Scaffold this active site. Structure first.
Site, PDB file in Angstrom:
ATOM      1  N   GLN A 101     -10.648  10.165   6.219  1.00 53.86           N
ATOM      2  CA  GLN A 101     -10.534   8.821   6.744  1.00 53.86           C
ATOM      3  C   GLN A 101      -9.328   8.166   6.047  1.00 53.86           C
ATOM      4  O   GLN A 101      -8.840   7.140   6.494  1.00 53.86           O
ATOM      5  CB  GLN A 101     -11.793   8.004   6.415  1.00 53.86           C
ATOM      6  CG  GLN A 101     -13.079   8.597   6.970  1.00 53.86           C
ATOM      7  CD  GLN A 101     -14.330   7.945   6.382  1.00 53.86           C
ATOM      8  OE1 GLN A 101     -14.649   6.794   6.684  1.00 53.86           O
ATOM      9  NE2 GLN A 101     -15.029   8.678   5.524  1.00 53.86           N
ATOM     10  N   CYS A 115       8.758   0.821  22.260  1.00 51.59           N
ATOM     11  CA  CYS A 115       9.244   2.074  22.833  1.00 51.59           C
ATOM     12  C   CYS A 115       8.423   3.281  22.378  1.00 51.59           C
ATOM     13  O   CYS A 115       8.673   4.406  22.806  1.00 51.59           O
ATOM     14  CB  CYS A 115      10.702   2.301  22.449  1.00 51.59           C
ATOM     15  SG  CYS A 115      10.915   2.978  20.807  1.00 51.59           S
ATOM     16  N   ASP A 168      -3.618   7.832   3.148  1.00 44.92           N
ATOM     17  CA  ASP A 168      -2.646   8.327   2.173  1.00 44.92           C
ATOM     18  C   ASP A 168      -2.414   9.786   2.539  1.00 44.92           C
ATOM     19  O   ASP A 168      -3.150  10.357   3.358  1.00 44.92           O
ATOM     20  CB  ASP A 168      -3.184   8.237   0.737  1.00 44.92           C
ATOM     21  CG  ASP A 168      -4.435   9.085   0.519  1.00 44.92           C
ATOM     22  OD1 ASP A 168      -4.357  10.339   0.595  1.00 44.92           O
ATOM     23  OD2 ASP A 168      -5.501   8.491   0.269  1.00 44.92           O
ATOM     24  N   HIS A 214      -7.884   8.390  10.814  1.00 40.49           N
ATOM     25  CA  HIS A 214      -7.347   7.045  10.910  1.00 40.49           C
ATOM     26  C   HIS A 214      -5.841   6.919  10.759  1.00 40.49           C
ATOM     27  O   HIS A 214      -5.342   5.865  10.381  1.00 40.49           O
ATOM     28  CB  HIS A 214      -8.059   6.153   9.881  1.00 40.49           C
ATOM     29  CG  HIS A 214      -9.555   6.181   9.992  1.00 40.49           C
ATOM     30  ND1 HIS A 214     -10.389   5.781   8.967  1.00 40.49           N
ATOM     31  CD2 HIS A 214     -10.366   6.570  11.004  1.00 40.49           C
ATOM     32  CE1 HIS A 214     -11.648   5.926   9.343  1.00 40.49           C
ATOM     33  NE2 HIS A 214     -11.662   6.403  10.575  1.00 40.49           N
ATOM     34  N   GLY A 224     -16.344  10.718  -1.571  1.00 36.85           N
ATOM     35  CA  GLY A 224     -15.640   9.449  -1.674  1.00 36.85           C
ATOM     36  C   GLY A 224     -15.708   8.493  -0.515  1.00 36.85           C
ATOM     37  O   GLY A 224     -14.794   7.676  -0.341  1.00 36.85           O
ATOM     38  N   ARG A 275       0.839  -1.203   0.000  1.00 35.49           N
ATOM     39  CA  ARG A 275       0.000   0.000   0.000  1.00 35.49           C
ATOM     40  C   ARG A 275       0.872   1.251   0.000  1.00 35.49           C
ATOM     41  O   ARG A 275       0.622   2.224  -0.746  1.00 35.49           O
ATOM     42  CB  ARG A 275      -0.918   0.025   1.237  1.00 35.49           C
ATOM     43  CG  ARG A 275      -1.987  -1.071   1.254  1.00 35.49           C
ATOM     44  CD  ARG A 275      -2.961  -0.923   2.450  1.00 35.49           C
ATOM     45  NE  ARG A 275      -3.715   0.324   2.389  1.00 35.49           N
ATOM     46  CZ  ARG A 275      -4.694   0.667   3.226  1.00 35.49           C
ATOM     47  NH1 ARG A 275      -5.055  -0.142   4.211  1.00 35.49           N
ATOM     48  NH2 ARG A 275      -5.327   1.829   3.069  1.00 35.49           N
ATOM     49  N   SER A 310     -18.155   5.649   1.736  1.00 35.16           N
ATOM     50  CA  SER A 310     -19.344   4.816   1.729  1.00 35.16           C
ATOM     51  C   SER A 310     -20.229   5.111   2.938  1.00 35.16           C
ATOM     52  O   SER A 310     -21.276   4.498   3.101  1.00 35.16           O
ATOM     53  CB  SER A 310     -18.960   3.337   1.694  1.00 35.16           C
ATOM     54  OG  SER A 310     -18.134   3.000   2.792  1.00 35.16           O
TER      55      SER A 310
HETATM   56  N1  LIG Z   1     -12.002   0.218   1.625  1.00 36.47           N
HETATM   57  C1  LIG Z   1     -12.382  -0.836   2.421  1.00 36.47           C
HETATM   58  O1  LIG Z   1     -12.778  -1.915   1.980  1.00 36.47           O
HETATM   59  C2  LIG Z   1     -12.352  -0.778   3.864  1.00 36.47           C
HETATM   60  C3  LIG Z   1     -12.823  -2.099   4.416  1.00 36.47           C
HETATM   61  C4  LIG Z   1     -12.814  -2.151   5.840  1.00 36.47           C
HETATM   62  C5  LIG Z   1     -12.439  -1.114   6.662  1.00 36.47           C
HETATM   63  N2  LIG Z   1     -12.060   0.045   5.929  1.00 36.47           N
HETATM   64  C6  LIG Z   1     -12.005   1.353   6.587  1.00 36.47           C
HETATM   65  O2  LIG Z   1     -13.138   2.074   6.146  1.00 36.47           O
HETATM   66  C7  LIG Z   1     -12.806   3.449   6.261  1.00 36.47           C
HETATM   67  C8  LIG Z   1     -13.724   4.299   5.439  1.00 36.47           C
HETATM   68  O3  LIG Z   1     -13.510   3.911   4.063  1.00 36.47           O
HETATM   69  P1  LIG Z   1     -14.176   4.734   2.926  1.00 36.47           P
HETATM   70  O4  LIG Z   1     -15.618   5.058   3.122  1.00 36.47           O
HETATM   71  O5  LIG Z   1     -13.383   5.987   2.744  1.00 36.47           O
HETATM   72  O6  LIG Z   1     -13.948   3.718   1.680  1.00 36.47           O
HETATM   73  P2  LIG Z   1     -14.904   2.681   1.039  1.00 36.47           P
HETATM   74  O7  LIG Z   1     -14.134   1.704   0.254  1.00 36.47           O
HETATM   75  O8  LIG Z   1     -15.719   1.963   2.052  1.00 36.47           O
HETATM   76  O9  LIG Z   1     -15.847   3.544   0.096  1.00 36.47           O
HETATM   77  C9  LIG Z   1     -15.288   4.345  -0.991  1.00 36.47           C
HETATM   78  C10 LIG Z   1     -16.404   5.189  -1.497  1.00 36.47           C
HETATM   79  O10 LIG Z   1     -16.000   6.102  -2.593  1.00 36.47           O
HETATM   80  C11 LIG Z   1     -16.835   5.943  -3.682  1.00 36.47           C
HETATM   81  N3  LIG Z   1     -16.033   6.210  -4.854  1.00 36.47           N
HETATM   82  C12 LIG Z   1     -15.386   5.368  -5.733  1.00 36.47           C
HETATM   83  N4  LIG Z   1     -14.724   6.032  -6.699  1.00 36.47           N
HETATM   84  C13 LIG Z   1     -14.970   7.368  -6.404  1.00 36.47           C
HETATM   85  C14 LIG Z   1     -14.551   8.583  -7.035  1.00 36.47           C
HETATM   86  N5  LIG Z   1     -13.780   8.596  -8.105  1.00 36.47           N
HETATM   87  N6  LIG Z   1     -14.976   9.780  -6.482  1.00 36.47           N
HETATM   88  C15 LIG Z   1     -15.779   9.732  -5.363  1.00 36.47           C
HETATM   89  N7  LIG Z   1     -16.208   8.649  -4.718  1.00 36.47           N
HETATM   90  C16 LIG Z   1     -15.773   7.491  -5.285  1.00 36.47           C
HETATM   91  C17 LIG Z   1     -17.371   4.547  -3.572  1.00 36.47           C
HETATM   92  O11 LIG Z   1     -18.566   4.406  -4.369  1.00 36.47           O
HETATM   93  C18 LIG Z   1     -17.594   4.393  -2.029  1.00 36.47           C
HETATM   94  O12 LIG Z   1     -18.801   4.932  -1.453  1.00 36.47           O
HETATM   95  C19 LIG Z   1     -11.350   3.516   5.783  1.00 36.47           C
HETATM   96  O13 LIG Z   1     -10.617   4.725   6.090  1.00 36.47           O
HETATM   97  C20 LIG Z   1     -10.764   2.196   6.362  1.00 36.47           C
HETATM   98  O14 LIG Z   1     -10.084   2.499   7.603  1.00 36.47           O
HETATM   99  C21 LIG Z   1     -11.991   0.212   4.575  1.00 36.47           C
HETATM  100 ZN   LIG Z   2      11.491   1.111  19.781  1.00 33.45          ZN
END
Ligand SMILES: NC(=O)c1ccc[n+]([C@@H]2O[C@H](COP(=O)([O-])OP(=O)(O)OC[C@H]3O[C@@H](n4cnc5c(N)ncnc54)[C@H](O)[C@@H]3O)[C@@H](O)[C@H]2O)c1
Ligand SMILES: [Zn+2]
Ligand SMILES: NC(=O)c1ccc[n+]([C@@H]2O[C@H](COP(=O)([O-])OP(=O)(O)OC[C@H]3O[C@@H](n4cnc5c(N)ncnc54)[C@H](O)[C@@H]3O)[C@@H](O)[C@H]2O)c1
Ligand SMILES: [Zn+2]
EC number: 2.3.1.286
Lengths: 256, 244
Positions: B97, B126, B100, B115, B184, B66, B186
């Site tokens: 969230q 440490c 990057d 996050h 961006g 990543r 979900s």
């Molecule tokens: N990505 C994962 O599968 C995942 C799974 C488990 C836990 N997590 C955690 O979930 C937290 C929240 O994740 P999230 O909601 O940011 O990611 P997500 O993967 O759950 O959702 C990404 C969202 O962006 C949308 N999307 C896709 N392309 C896009 C674009 N070009 N412009 C705008 N939207 C676009 C999607 O339709 C979706 O609703 C993360 O920070 C992570 O810690 C992530």
């Molecule tokens: Zn250390």
């Protein structure tokens, strides 16, 4: 006592050089005197900034709790001077002896980073370091490139609490792992160079005793005699810069 | 649209919340239930402290991958658009969230990382913490210079508390904003999914940007079914013209 004199070698003679060159596990313990020649004076009882406090009155958790700004003003001043200081001949000599494979580990009471900057790889900071800034509340810890400007007190970006110098003050436990490492190192040492320390602050002052009790030799370097002298196999009255410099040269030649 | 544009241009304190989707157009795909590397697990199964404890190498390998992708990506039009909105004095604070660093790399100044970040690595023993410029090669597990212990990614995994001050600051921004752009995300993962509710409950507006509808959609004053890159690019231009 005067009726219990213990005598030590006081020169760079062949037996001393032989003890260092032929050691199987030589370590070192340094105090503030080792940096005096880098522009970082020993405090000699005065804070060096306002000059009204014994260092211990500021390097204290109670004092920090009572006036974080004053204690931080003192540490930022120390930090800036240390960061701008340069390793002296002693620091370089210790690094050299480590490069030569003779010095196995350097335990220091100093909070400056001059041993590291001289190139010493294996350094244990018994009392922490001015390079580290850590939170008073959570475990957040990190190193800094420069002294912080103290108009505002530094605050942790994880818990919002007050940050503090990453050093060990009196009244505070040393980090368990750090202590453990130091003990194992001296319990392992057959020779130990003790330079630039007043040999009074504990438990650092006791480390040379462990080497002693296990049959090892003690080589003290101090322009002053200390509580350790009576048990030192060698006590050299001179500055660490000049003495260690001469010491590493000879060891260097003899080690070839 | 004209009202949408006005809501933004006349906002008294607009903030934003972004998710994985605003970095998709930078070559960093949203996971969609897969790890994207072995495509064998849900990401939740790797970004987990138990998983880290049980198999450090596997988790580190995932994060190294990543990291390398993130460090070599470039900020896209959305990151740029948010940076601009902040330059114009419209965007007061951005909460993300994302782990990057594309927002701040695009210039964004006021950014709260709910996050943590892939740029941060810290010792599990440490606690020393520092930032890195390149991803590690995992033949060996990454270890602390100061104590030799095992390092770990400086992100917040499920099951770990968010840095309190970070949670505290994000709450105070939302309890202060009259408009929030949610792009961006979900809107399922908490407590981030709840931040827009606070803005709504205090009478503010919600502008959602997502090619999909989410649980947030029904309470959004505006929902733009498009890529954050395109959408935000246009938006920010009009907001600049309207304010010209
Ligand atoms: N990505 C994962 O599968 C995942 C799974 C488990 C836990 N997590 C955690 O979930 C937290 C929240 O994740 P999230 O909601 O940011 O990611 P997500 O993967 O759950 O959702 C990404 C969202 O962006 C949308 N999307 C896709 N392309 C896009 C674009 N070009 N412009 C705008 N939207 C676009 C999607 O339709 C979706 O609703 C993360 O920070 C992570 O810690 C992530
Ligand atoms: Zn250390
Ligand atoms: N320095 C202080 O005033 C002070 C005061 C209170 C608490 N403390 C604590 O005491 C601990 C132990 O301190 P310490 O023993 O390292 O410092 P110290 O100030 O107590 O002693 C320094 C020693 O180095 C000697 N010295 C001076 N110039 C030298 C040179 N050029 N080469 C070699 N030796 C030289 C001095 O004679 C003295 O024995 C510290 O790490 C600190 O936490 C220090
Ligand atoms: Zn903290």
């Amino acid at each position: 006592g005067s009726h219990h004199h213990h005598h030590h070698g006081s020169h760079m003679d062949e037996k001393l050089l032989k003890t260092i060159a032929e050691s199987k596990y030589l370590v070192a313990l340094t105090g503030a005197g080792v940096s005096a020649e880098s522009g970082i004076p020993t405090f000699r009882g005065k804070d060096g900034l306002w000059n009204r406090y014994r260092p211990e009155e500021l390097a204290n958790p109670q004092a920090f709790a009572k006036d974080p700004e004053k204690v931080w003003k003192w540490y930022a001043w120390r930090m800036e001077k240390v960061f701008n200081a340069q390793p002296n001949k002693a620091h370089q000599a210790f690094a050299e002896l480590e490069r030569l494979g003779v010095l196995k580990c350097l335990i220091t009471q100093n909070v400056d980073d001059l041993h590291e900057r001289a190139g010493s790889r294996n350094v244990i900071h018994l009392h922490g370091s001015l390079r580290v800034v850590r939170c008073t509340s959570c475990n957040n810890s990190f190193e800094v490139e420069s002294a912080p400007k103290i108009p505002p007190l530094p605050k942790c970006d994880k818990c919002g609490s007050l940050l503090r110098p990453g050093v060990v003050w009196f009244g505070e436990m040393l980090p368990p792992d750090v202590l453990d490492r130091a003990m194992r190192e001296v319990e392992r040492a057959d020779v130990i160079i003790v330079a630039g320390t007043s040999a009074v602050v504990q438990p650092a002052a006791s480390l040379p005793l462990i080497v002693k009790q296990r049959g090892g030799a003690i080589i003290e370097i101090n322009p002053d005699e200390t509580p350790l002298t009576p048990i030192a196999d060698y006590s050299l009255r001179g500055k660490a810069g000049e003495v260690m410099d001469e010491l590493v040269r000879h060891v260097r030649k003899a080690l070839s």
